[PDB]
Amino acid sequence: GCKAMYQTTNNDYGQPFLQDNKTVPTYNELVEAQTEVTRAEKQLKNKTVATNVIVPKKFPLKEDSYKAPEPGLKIGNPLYMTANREYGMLKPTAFEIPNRFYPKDNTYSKSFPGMHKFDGLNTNITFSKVHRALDE
Amino acid sequence: QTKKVEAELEENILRKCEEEKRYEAEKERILNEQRMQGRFVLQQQMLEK
Amino acid sequence: MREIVHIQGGQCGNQIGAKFWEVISDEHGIDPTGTYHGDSDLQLERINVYYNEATGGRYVPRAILMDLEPGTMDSVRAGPFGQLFRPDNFVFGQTGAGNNWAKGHYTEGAELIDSVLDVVRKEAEGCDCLQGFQITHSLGGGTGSGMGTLLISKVREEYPDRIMETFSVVPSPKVSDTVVEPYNATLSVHQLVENADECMVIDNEALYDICFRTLKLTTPTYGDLNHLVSAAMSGVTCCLRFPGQLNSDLRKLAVNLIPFPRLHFFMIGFAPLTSRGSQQYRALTVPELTQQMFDAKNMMCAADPRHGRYLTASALFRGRMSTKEVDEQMLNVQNKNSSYFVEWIPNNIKSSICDIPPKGLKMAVTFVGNSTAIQEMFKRVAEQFTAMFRRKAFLHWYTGEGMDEMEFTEAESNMNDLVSEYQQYQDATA
Amino acid sequence: MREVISIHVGQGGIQVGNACWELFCLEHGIQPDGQMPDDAFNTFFSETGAGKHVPRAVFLDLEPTVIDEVRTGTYRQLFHPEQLISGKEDAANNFARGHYTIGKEIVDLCLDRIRKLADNCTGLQGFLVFNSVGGGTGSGLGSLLLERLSVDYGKKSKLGFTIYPSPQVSTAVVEPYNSILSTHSLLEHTDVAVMLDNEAIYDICRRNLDIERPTYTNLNRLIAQVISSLTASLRFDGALNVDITEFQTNLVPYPRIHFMLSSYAPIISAEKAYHEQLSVAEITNSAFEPANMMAKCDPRHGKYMACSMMYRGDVVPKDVNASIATIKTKRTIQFVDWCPTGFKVGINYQPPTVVPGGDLAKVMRAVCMISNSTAIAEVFSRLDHKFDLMYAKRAFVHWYVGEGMEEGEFSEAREDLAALEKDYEEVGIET
Amino acid sequence: MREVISIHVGQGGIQVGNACWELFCLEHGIQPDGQMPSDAFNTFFSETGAGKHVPRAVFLDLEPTVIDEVRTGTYRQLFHPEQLISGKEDAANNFARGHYTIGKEIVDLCLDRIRKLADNCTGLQGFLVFNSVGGGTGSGLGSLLLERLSVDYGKKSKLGFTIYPSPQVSTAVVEPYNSILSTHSLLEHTDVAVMLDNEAIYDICRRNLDIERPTYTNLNRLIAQVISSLTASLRFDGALNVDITEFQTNLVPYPRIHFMLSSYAPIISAEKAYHEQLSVAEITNSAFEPANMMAKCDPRHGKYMACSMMYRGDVVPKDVNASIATIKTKRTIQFVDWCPTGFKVGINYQPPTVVPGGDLAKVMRAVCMISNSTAIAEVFSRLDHKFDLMYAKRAFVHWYVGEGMEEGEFSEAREDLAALEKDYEEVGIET
Numbered sequence A: 001g002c003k004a005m006y007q008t009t010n011n012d013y014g015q016p017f018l019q020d021n022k023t024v025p026t027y028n029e030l031v032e033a034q035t036e037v038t039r040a041e042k043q044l045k046n047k048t049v050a051t052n053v054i055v056p057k058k059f060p061l062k063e064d065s066y067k068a069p070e071p072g073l074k075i076g077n078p079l080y081m082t083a084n085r086e087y088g089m090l091k092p093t094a095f096e097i098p099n100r101f102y103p104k105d106n107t108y109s110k111s112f113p114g115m116h117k118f119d120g121l122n123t124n125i126t127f128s129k130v131h132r133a134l135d136e
Numbered sequence B: 001q002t003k004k005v006e007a008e009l010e011e012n013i014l015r016k017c018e019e020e021k022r023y024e025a026e027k028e029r030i031l032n033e034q035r036m037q038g039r040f041v042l043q044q045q046m047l048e049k
Numbered sequence C: 001m002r003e004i005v006h007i008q009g010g011q012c013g014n015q016i017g018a019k020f021w022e023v024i025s026d027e028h029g030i031d032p033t034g035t036y037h038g039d040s041d042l043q044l045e046r047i048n049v050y051y052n053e054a055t056g057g058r059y060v061p062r063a064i065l066m067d068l069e070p071g072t073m074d075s076v077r078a079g080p081f082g083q084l085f086r087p088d089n090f091v092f093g094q095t096g097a098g099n100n101w102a103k104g105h106y107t108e109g110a111e112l113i114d115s116v117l118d119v120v121r122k123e124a125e126g127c128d129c130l131q132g133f134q135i136t137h138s139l140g141g142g143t144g145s146g147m148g149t150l151l152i153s154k155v156r157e158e159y160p161d162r163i164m165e166t167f168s169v170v171p172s173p174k175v176s177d178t179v180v181e182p183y184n185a186t187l188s189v190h191q192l193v194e195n196a197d198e199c200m201v202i203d204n205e206a207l208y209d210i211c212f213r214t215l216k217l218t219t220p221t222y223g224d225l226n227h228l229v230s231a232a233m234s235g236v237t238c239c240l241r242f243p244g245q246l247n248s249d250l251r252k253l254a255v256n257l258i259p260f261p262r263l264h265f266f267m268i269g270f271a272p273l274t275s276r277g278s279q280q281y282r283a284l285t286v287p288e289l290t291q292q293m294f295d296a297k298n299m300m301c302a303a304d305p306r307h308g309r310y311l312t313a314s315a316l317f318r319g320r321m322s323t324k325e326v327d328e329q330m331l332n333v334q335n336k337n338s339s340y341f342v343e344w345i346p347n348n349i350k351s352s353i354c355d356i357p358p359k360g361l362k363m364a365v366t367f368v369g370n371s372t373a374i375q376e377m378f379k380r381v382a383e384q385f386t387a388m389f390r391r392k393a394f395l396h397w398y399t400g401e402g403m404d405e406m407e408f409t410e411a412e413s414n415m416n417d418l419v420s421e422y423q424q425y426q427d428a429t430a
Numbered sequence D: 001m002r003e004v005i006s007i008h009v010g011q012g013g014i015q016v017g018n019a020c021w022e023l024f025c026l027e028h029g030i031q032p033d034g035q036m037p038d039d040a041f042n043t044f045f046s047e048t049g050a051g052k053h054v055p056r057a058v059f060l061d062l063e064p065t066v067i068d069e070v071r072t073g074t075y076r077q078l079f080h081p082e083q084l085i086s087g088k089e090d091a092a093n094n095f096a097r098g099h100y101t102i103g104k105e106i107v108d109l110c111l112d113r114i115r116k117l118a119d120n121c122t123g124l125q126g127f128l129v130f131n132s133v134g135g136g137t138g139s140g141l142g143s144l145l146l147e148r149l150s151v152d153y154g155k156k157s158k159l160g161f162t163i164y165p166s167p168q169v170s171t172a173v174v175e176p177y178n179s180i181l182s183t184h185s186l187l188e189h190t191d192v193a194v195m196l197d198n199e200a201i202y203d204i205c206r207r208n209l210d211i212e213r214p215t216y217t218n219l220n221r222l223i224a225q226v227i228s229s230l231t232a233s234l235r236f237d238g239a240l241n242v243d244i245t246e247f248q249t250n251l252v253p254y255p256r257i258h259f260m261l262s263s264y265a266p267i268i269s270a271e272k273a274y275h276e277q278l279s280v281a282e283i284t285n286s287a288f289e290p291a292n293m294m295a296k297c298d299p300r301h302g303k304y305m306a307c308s309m310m311y312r313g314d315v316v317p318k319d320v321n322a323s324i325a326t327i328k329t330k331r332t333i334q335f336v337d338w339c340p341t342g343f344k345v346g347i348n349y350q351p352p353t354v355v356p357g358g359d360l361a362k363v364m365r366a367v368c369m370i371s372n373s374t375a376i377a378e379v380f381s382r383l384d385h386k387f388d389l390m391y392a393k394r395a396f397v398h399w400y401v402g403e404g405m406e407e408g409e410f411s412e413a414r415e416d417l418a419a420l421e422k423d424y425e426e427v428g429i430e431t
Numbered sequence E: 001m002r003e004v005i006s007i008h009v010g011q012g013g014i015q016v017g018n019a020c021w022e023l024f025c026l027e028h029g030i031q032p033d034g035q036m037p038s039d040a041f042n043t044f045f046s047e048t049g050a051g052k053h054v055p056r057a058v059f060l061d062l063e064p065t066v067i068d069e070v071r072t073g074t075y076r077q078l079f080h081p082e083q084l085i086s087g088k089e090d091a092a093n094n095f096a097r098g099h100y101t102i103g104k105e106i107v108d109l110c111l112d113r114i115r116k117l118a119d120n121c122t123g124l125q126g127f128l129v130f131n132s133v134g135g136g137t138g139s140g141l142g143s144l145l146l147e148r149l150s151v152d153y154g155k156k157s158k159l160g161f162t163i164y165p166s167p168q169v170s171t172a173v174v175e176p177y178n179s180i181l182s183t184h185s186l187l188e189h190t191d192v193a194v195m196l197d198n199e200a201i202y203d204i205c206r207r208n209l210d211i212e213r214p215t216y217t218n219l220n221r222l223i224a225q226v227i228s229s230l231t232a233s234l235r236f237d238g239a240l241n242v243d244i245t246e247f248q249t250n251l252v253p254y255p256r257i258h259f260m261l262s263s264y265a266p267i268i269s270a271e272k273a274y275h276e277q278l279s280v281a282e283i284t285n286s287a288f289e290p291a292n293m294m295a296k297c298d299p300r301h302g303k304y305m306a307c308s309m310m311y312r313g314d315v316v317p318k319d320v321n322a323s324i325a326t327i328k329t330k331r332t333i334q335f336v337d338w339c340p341t342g343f344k345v346g347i348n349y350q351p352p353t354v355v356p357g358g359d360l361a362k363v364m365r366a367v368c369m370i371s372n373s374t375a376i377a378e379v380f381s382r383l384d385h386k387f388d389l390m391y392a393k394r395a396f397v398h399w400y401v402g403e404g405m406e407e408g409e410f411s412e413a414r415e416d417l418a419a420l421e422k423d424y425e426e427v428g429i430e431t
């Protein structure tokens, strides 16, 4: 909470006068002094409170942490190595890592539980088609 | 304009608080793995003894 | 004032929009967090045309991104300037169409359209005064070509007096990527001609060819393609957002270009466009700009415009120039090329001037031409369509999802009638 | 959000799946124990909630030897302990045994496993199935699974990677019979079939890899590379993606014709891979080269219907389109008349990965084609000839008759193959 | 200030009491000697003023062996020495022994102990009683104790956890007689009864724990886990707490129908526990899986009356109620028409524990459900058939006659079971 949102009605009632009587700006100067006023109002709120090429990500595993596991079955001799076990004896080395990795992230769409239908009641109001000065 | 921009300044702080709440939810998520790893290693060695 | 709302669907359309929004944000000096860092006051006078103001003070595009597969929008969000789009406006499916017009127009899209039409209704009503709608899509794909055109019909049924602009990518028979392209192309164009107020054709083949020839760039890509088409799109409505000597909006272009209600298919071009090594060699003047815009090699369509006669043409200039010079340039170009200009309508060139140039360039021009030369794309597409259709190839799906060959025959007949009527005026004499 | 379920049945299926899952884990960085040391593995894996990952595969067999080898080998920890289903008695090359006697008591548990696995996934794309056709249990269980699944799930896509016996080299002597029977069974139930005869791949291995000592390890590694290249679009970002639903969009003119044949490029050893620049045009010409076709069939003997090729690497759309232009220019390769354009090409950024201790050299650009052409009638003709040579005198028939199969059942298969041949010959004619 | 008094009678009661009292002391961190290492316990234990705690349990038996084993075991220092009441002779599976001859001289001491225990407690909710129905002493003493308490205390609630004979697995031959007699006695006296036959638990242990040669210890551990899951709501904080008096106010449509059957999930060993999510939806589906009942009855053969389930762990009401909606959507589970809603849910934060040397692995989410369903008539039917086959020729009746029990008594129990079966059949029809 902040103090500014504590200001209340009945306090806007008569409360001094912002400018001293002796320092009135004159006509021509005010008439030439519109632009800074306008840009102040319009993007005061933008500067204060409002404030290529594909890239590859790194591969998940680092080589020094491969820690390949031994087989549960304890083979005694090289003679009895079977023809099904060649898959995966050799740990990858510096040569076999892919240099670049381009994954797909789905975290944005792993959300939005369901599409929305406005289960509401108009409230559109009319703006008129030509020179809104006659629309109610 | 000063008071209105103070209001949006408050709204930004509200975002910051809710983001920290999301990070707290992630810290909560850590708990399951933190239990699981050691818990199941010991529970698997239990039958081995 | 007189603002328009953007809608894009299909991955081709999403890639188009991602570059279009980046280009317009760069033009107005909007950072990808929505905060202003431009220099000129004129940069922000008409920002409400495309942007809506949010609390805190950022600007958000009034764009409706729609798709039947979420990977495309997940990709575009991670891209640069992806944060601008409001999360609410995204609408997506979980199945996709698989390049099947029947699936994307009858089965899945019919159920999914409710939310997207609701958000279109809300966003369109929210703005002050509607000027029109604009859509970008590719005709070679099932989901795009079907759902986009069905949504066009639905929006037309609800806003009959508004204008609708479409940027359609057509499947050229030269660079062909899918075997079922002619089918959904014809099926889409049948519905498009009846509803869309303006349709402007873009060909991947022609874009690639101009990239190879006038850019002379070694390895062109979809990024450069989207950049070219984005500059072309922005040039159309630049004079809408900025004051100029001859302000001209989309409704004025529509009234000026189409002699008859069903002839609203245009081909466009952009200039100046030079190789990077010769950019300082060339001499940017009005005569060079006009000879470049009227060069047949600069058109972004495969059609050869010299094989037919121009019905109407129009040019939009960016930068400050003397209007008279442009005037006699158009006059002399029309005078010597009376053979290529249809005669029963005198002075068939429109020109508009806007005093703001593109960032980094001193003059620019965008060309639109309604000519009878486009009939060749339609003829070749219909030829491929009938070649595939005589042997009843691939028809079993479209039969299996509530659709049948009767409306295929009707679509072929309608397309042939359109071609014949478009050609009838080519030989017309006074 | 996209998921696909893999089925391996038969000894050939298991020995191919082991190699393919080796390559998948190597590609996604998952260590053999299943524990890693944004979400791309979701195509083939499932997160356990905390730690390791579970493959989305099922292994089936009736002889326990290979299943036990899997459950004891280095990849033991990876699979769920209760998804490697093993029977007790082998069908022993008898399709009748594997389709009427023993498989009926294992198919139930298989379907419970399949249902429980499909329940976890939310965006199920389809099924892959692997089975050697020249085996009793393979053919029978595969046929039964396809017939059951096609009615349980309906419109879901299924892709069968069948290894048809070579024209003249085969292991057994009874494989034509069960090949014909299983072909009849799958013709009305599989949406896509891929030809994978062994002899052509053996030819490729002896010629290009320069290996005079080839075994099934190299065969399975090649098939795994083909699978990975085919599925890269589901789990890797690219300038032009394709879904498994976007295959029968371009490869299936009519529901009866759904058998296609594959090819891969480039194939070269590391000792001479670095003596060439390996252009995209060169590799795509090697792709359409008839002798590099993965199936022992001659494309020069018939028309093409349609081809779809996947490129992975740093290829350029102009490179692809320029190559396709030259291919269309070529006179020797002729397409069917009613297909003006028949090419479907896709692009993916991820270069192919190399397996340590393998034979294939690491190359930055690769292309994998699936083609549907009229030439496929020749293998069916020779299979029918071999089937007739044996059935002319009722050889081996009593072994199938004594396992519950009726006498006449061969007649319907023979007639269906005749109808298939006539359908190809009549769709191959010009109008 | 919430207490409940626990009664153990019979060998089955003692053998489950040992297991459950090990579990409770593991829950509350109390060493077997009774000391606490340096308020939730107040439900089950009472403070001695300085040091240890005394469980609120009483053990009754006419068999000195198990009592002596308890008094010589590791828990010798926990229980009060003068609440382990032991007799001199066993009933020898004869109901008349434990109901008319030998239990009358011990029931007075039992009631004196009960009075002394109840005087200390101030906010007692009721009694939990454990007994075996197939034992003479268990049945007779349970019947006599319930008859005495029902007039001594009045409206206090009593819960009987009875282990009924299996359809065909059994250890005795005369047990239908004592079973029918005990049903006659406690039908009028027990507010809530739980069916816990052994064969279903055997099947659970075989299928899930993958234990091929288990014993009664595993059964008793499972029963203790169920009891703790039931009673955690009284001694731990929960988002939706349920009391003992909050069970009968939902689970008993009519005064006669008060037998329920339970299920518990998950039941998974650590060898494969960490291979799956253990998600709320899958555990609540496992709860209603017909094979996971600890009672050998088929829920599919009858309508449901009322289901009350307690979740413990990090469960979320969103998840729970979303699962309940799916269950209601499911077709193969049907409820009686006059019960539009039948679910009583409870949520607690305390996760279940693991006991050292056990088989189960603890998990972050557990569910225990109690169901009253119309299918329970089948067990009464089969027990009635077993009774009739033996009583047709007056087999074994003379040893019940010769111990003071009059002959005609069996007819009354038979006609009351007939009345109960008729009541179930009547209430099972739709309106």
Ligand SMILES: Nc1nc2c(ncn2[C@@H]2O[C@H](COP(=O)(O)OP(=O)(O)OP(=O)(O)O)[C@@H](O)[C@H]2O)c(=O)[nH]1
Binding pocket: D009, D010, D011, D012, D013, D015, D016, D063, D090, D091, D092, D093, D094, D132, D133, D134, D135, D136, D137, D138, D139, D163, D165, D170, D171, D172, D175, D198, D216, D219, D220
């Ligand atoms: N490509 C390839 N084919 C194989 C491999 N192993 C077996 N086959 C083929 O499988 C056919 C016979 O079936 P098998 O795989 O040996 O065994 P099965 O399919 O389980 O049938 P059964 O032998 O009855 O158990 C042979 O003709 C081989 O061509 C392999 O490792 N690679």
Ligand SMILES: Nc1nc2c(ncn2[C@@H]2O[C@H](COP(=O)(O)OP(=O)(O)OP(=O)(O)O)[C@@H](O)[C@H]2O)c(=O)[nH]1
Binding pocket: E009, E010, E011, E012, E013, E015, E016, E063, E090, E091, E092, E093, E094, E132, E133, E134, E135, E136, E137, E138, E139, E163, E170, E171, E172, E198, E216, E217, E219, E220
């Ligand atoms: N679940 C389980 N049931 C048991 C156990 N011990 C005995 N029972 C059951 O008890 C029934 C018979 O009663 P018992 O407990 O053996 O003996 P009893 O109830 O004290 O009656 P008596 O034999 O006269 O002493 C058998 O049918 C068993 O099913 C046990 O440790 N676990």
Ligand SMILES: Nc1nc2c(ncn2[C@@H]2O[C@H](COP(=O)(O)OP(=O)(O)O)[C@@H](O)[C@H]2O)c(=O)[nH]1
Binding pocket: C009, C010, C011, C012, C015, C016, C099, C138, C140, C141, C142, C143, C144, C145, C177, C204, C222, C223, C225, C226, D239
């Ligand atoms: N300009 C441009 N066109 C593209 C891009 N990506 C794809 N295309 C075009 O889109 C066509 C394929 O569209 P398709 O995938 O079927 O659209 P869908 O139906 O929405 O899936 C191809 O012919 C390409 O020419 C891109 O990044 N830029």
Ligand SMILES: [Mg+2]
Binding pocket: D010, D011, D012, D135, D137
């Ligand atoms: Mg085999």
Ligand SMILES: [Mg+2]
Binding pocket: E010, E011, E012, E063, E135, E137
């Ligand atoms: Mg006993």
